Write a protein that binds this ligand. Structure first.
Ligand SMILES: *[C@@H]1O[C@H](CO)[C@@H](O[C@@H]2O[C@H](CO)[C@@H](O[C@@H]3O[C@H](CO)[C@@H](O)[C@H](O[C@H]4O[C@H](CO)[C@@H](O)[C@H](O)[C@@H]4O)[C@@H]3O)[C@H](O)[C@H]2NC(C)=O)[C@H](O)[C@H]1NC(C)=O
Ligand SMILES: *[C@@H]1O[C@H](CO)[C@@H](O[C@@H]2O[C@H](CO)[C@@H](O[C@@H]3O[C@H](CO)[C@@H](O)[C@H](O[C@H]4O[C@H](CO)[C@@H](O)[C@H](O)[C@@H]4O)[C@@H]3O)[C@H](O)[C@H]2NC(C)=O)[C@H](O)[C@H]1NC(C)=O
Ligand SMILES: *[C@@H]1O[C@H](CO)[C@@H](O[C@@H]2O[C@H](CO)[C@@H](O)[C@H](O)[C@H]2NC(C)=O)[C@H](O)[C@H]1NC(C)=O
Ligand SMILES: *[C@@H]1O[C@H](CO)[C@@H](O)[C@H](O)[C@H]1NC(C)=O
Ligand SMILES: *[C@@H]1O[C@H](CO)[C@@H](O)[C@H](O)[C@H]1NC(C)=O
Ligand SMILES: *[C@@H]1O[C@H](CO)[C@@H](O)[C@H](O)[C@H]1NC(C)=O
Lengths: 395, 396
């Protein structure tokens, strides 16, 4: 989308995976969807260094709205859970130097069953721009035909544009056309800042693998259409929650950098382990994700339960990820020829190699015909960065 | 099996899941299957308090033997990886106060392709007893028919008995029997100390869930046949490795106590986190597993992605596990009536409830008519212990 936004993948925090549609503030005041929850997160996004690492969008997913529209056709923030309304919440977020994201749906209802934006796109767009919303996640639930889906997403895109406010526009569009309708990604890119490609993520390794394999399998279709202003969205980071082992967490962070994915954490920032904080705030990895060239990586090869993914970076550099898919045994040795990496330009005549994950370590110079050995944990990933020695010497 | 062994589930360490069939001592000296590996583990089992916690079987899985039997048709310890042979290794293990486990296969070949024990049961049984072996894991690979499977397992059972040495006998029998017909568990418990119900296991939550669900599904056939001297084997503990989140590890430890399962760790004892050590060595949970009454627990109910498992313990005590199977969101609240627990005997007129996992915490006294609330993590488990207040007032 040509609105000058998301020139690098959007980063931030989205409540859904971690907190869901919890409406019981009586029994569960600390994890129900309320203005208090988002204020706490906003405070912490600053004080814990999340903003400094780059995460600046505090995003409300589903279940923020009251059951009915008001007498002027507007969506209403739930009276009990958001008594001070969205506007004040937006103001609070802006004062912390952050931006605010909200959620709506292209159909008659949101996925959780609350009011949809069908036949209200213009009204709803204006309401968001007025409050000071900076990002809209637009979901594809309860849409009766593919035609309405298309028009709806297109309509909201232009409806937002007319308001004159900069709003990052996030579309579940292509996800709702699977598998028997090929989405037009040229078309989707024209109207969206990023787009959800596949099924909802959850707190599991099964989900991550499912997402990775879908991406890699369909890579020819989706990789090249991504770039500054328009990204593929493999969904929220679930690092720091409950369902992933440490190695699986590392795999997500690494691969999301490779895929030039938006980085939306969905976790409890009040209760997050120091390791997780460190991984999610890793400077070097975030830098790979945020690489200004903005070219999405891809799976280079697979076999023997190993996977090699690579991504071209600005300054003729390269990120390379190696995944151990074998879910039995211990750290498994893997050896690749550096000549295979980066279409054979990366290490010609040579390249310097730094490991970024699971730990940072400078591995040194590897010439054009040399081999690299690593040991990768079951379900883990090794992430590397390759500087070409020709480029390196140039100032 | 009526050999006076495994009166409580056997505990120890088995190399397979963690180290597999690694034969490259050249490139990987520290994780290839060697005598050196097992000596290191033996040293550590003592010095790190594993023996004290109860783990006393150091077990060799597949890929210990040479490719060929010697001229007298005996299995040979691989010349490079076990140059001092099994007998010396056994001696070393005994001097540390531990016991030694070995692996063989009922068919023509082991799962990894090494010599099988078919037509050598007597010879092989004698070889083991001579060496000082204390436990045999007997696998069901490369068996052409189900009759041979049965006879083979029966034969080795008696072949071991004839040697006169006490040997814990572990059978993959029913696991390899399942993809054809329903196993006779009365028959299996006659000849086996414990029995594997599954193909294998791995370092994954997927595997744990799969094991739990099959066990609960088939609990009518299998739970009641278990008891002192004969146990259901849901396979190795994978805690402390790579593929499980902390919560999933807790779930495995808790449920393996409920199921009166053997506790064979498969991990690298040289590189294990303090947390994993603490959980694997947890005194109270091990005590539940090792409860002398020796009754296997069962799934009490399931629904809404919650599961309740319970186990009767001696002294009219009860262990109760509650699993959150929902793999999305956060700590989900769950509430049960204490009258439902322990066939309604556990908390009548009341019970004292202690939480053992994920942390230890005294909850208090609960009347027969009261409800208990917990919050359980996605893929986690809460493990409780219930003492009845009639049994408590009987402090005299
Ligand atoms: C509503 O839709 C309209 C119609 O597309 C949209 O207008 C477009 O806005 C973009 C982004 O602001 C304009 O692109 C700019 O064009 C100027 C002049 O040629 C350039 O100098 C700008 O360069 C930027 O990008 C560079 C990186 O690529 C940066 O280095 C530099 O610092 C600049 O930031 C930029 O390319 C575009 O011309 C219009 N298009 C048309 C046809 O008018 C408008 O933004 C939308 N409104 C809202 C509120 O969303
Ligand atoms: C080979 O197979 C034979 C035949 O099956 C097997 O003999 C059995 O051994 C067991 C264990 O040694 C014997 O069972 C015990 O018998 C005594 C005396 O009658 C009882 O006191 C025992 O009762 C309890 O007390 C013990 C507590 O100290 C416990 O050990 C025990 O679990 C009980 O709670 C117990 O029943 C049994 O008598 C024989 N059976 C027959 C028919 O001979 C032999 O041990 C096997 N040999 C080898 C080397 O494995
Ligand atoms: C998918 O959609 C895009 C954008 O609408 C198509 O590109 C346009 O094609 C139409 C012809 O119907 C032309 O009028 C425009 O000039 C094209 N615009 C651009 C920017 O290319 C594209 O052809 C469609 N692709 C498929 C396979 O249907
Ligand atoms: C929503 O509901 C109306 C009335 O039932 C229907 O005609 C319309 O097509 C629906 N819109 C979508 C996008 O599903
Ligand atoms: C081992 O091989 C022989 C020859 O093929 C066969 O007759 C015998 O049944 C096999 N044994 C088993 C248990 O598979
Ligand atoms: C299993 O077979 C044995 C004989 O081997 C017999 O005693 C017993 O009745 C059978 N049990 C069942 C459950 O069929």
């Amino acid at each position: 989308l040509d609105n000058g936004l998301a020139r690098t993948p959007t980063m931030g925090w989205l409540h859904w995976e971690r907190f869901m549609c919890n409406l019981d503030c009586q029994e569960e005041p600390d994890s129900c969807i309320s203005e208090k929850l988002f204020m706490e997160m906003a405070e912490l996004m600053v004080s814990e260094g999340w903003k400094d690492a780059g995460y600046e969008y505090l995003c409300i997913d589903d279940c923020w709205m009251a059951p009915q529209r008001d007498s002027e056709g507007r969506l209403q923030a739930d009276p009990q859970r958001f008594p001070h309304g969205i506007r004040q919440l937006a103001n609070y977020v802006h004062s912390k130097g952050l931006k605010l994201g909200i959620y709506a749906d292209v159909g008659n209802k949101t996925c959780a069953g609350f009011p949809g934006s069908f036949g209200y796109y213009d009204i709803d767009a204006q309401t968001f721009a007025d409050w000071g919303v900076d990002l809209l996640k637009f979901d594809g639930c309860y849409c009766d035909s593919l035609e309405n889906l298309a028009d709806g997403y297109k309509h909201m895109s232009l409806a937002l544009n007319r308001t004159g406010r900069s709003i990052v526009y996030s579309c579940s569009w292509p996800a709702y056309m699977w598998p028997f309708q090929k989405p037009n990604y040229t078309e989707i890119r024209q109207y969206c800042n990023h787009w959800r490609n596949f099924a909802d993520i959850d707190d599991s390794w099964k989900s991550i693998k499912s997402i990775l394999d879908w991406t890699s399998f369909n890579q020819e279709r989706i990789v090249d259409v991504a770039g500054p202003g328009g990204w593929n969205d493999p969904d929220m980071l679930v690092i720091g929650n409950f369902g992933l082992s440490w190695n699986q967490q590392v795999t997500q962070m690494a691969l999301w950098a490779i895929m030039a994915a938006p980085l939306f954490m969905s976790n409890d920032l009040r209760h997050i382990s120091p390791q997780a904080k460190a991984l999610l705030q890793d400077k070097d990895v975030i830098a790979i994700n945020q690489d200004p060239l903005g070219k999405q990586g891809y799976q280079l090869r697979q076999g023997d339960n190993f996977e090699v993914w690579e991504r071209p970076l600005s300054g003729l550099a390269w990120a390379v990820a190696m995944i151990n898919r074998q879910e039995i045994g211990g750290p498994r040795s893997y050896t690749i020829a550096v000549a295979s990496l980066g279409k054979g330009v990366a290490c010609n005549p040579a390249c310097f190699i730094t490991q970024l994950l699971p730990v940072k370590r400078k591995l040194g110079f590897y010439e054009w015909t040399s081999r690299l050995r690593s040991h990768i944990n079951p379900t883990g990933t090794v992430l590397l960065q390759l500087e070409n020695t020709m480029q390196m010497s140039l100032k």
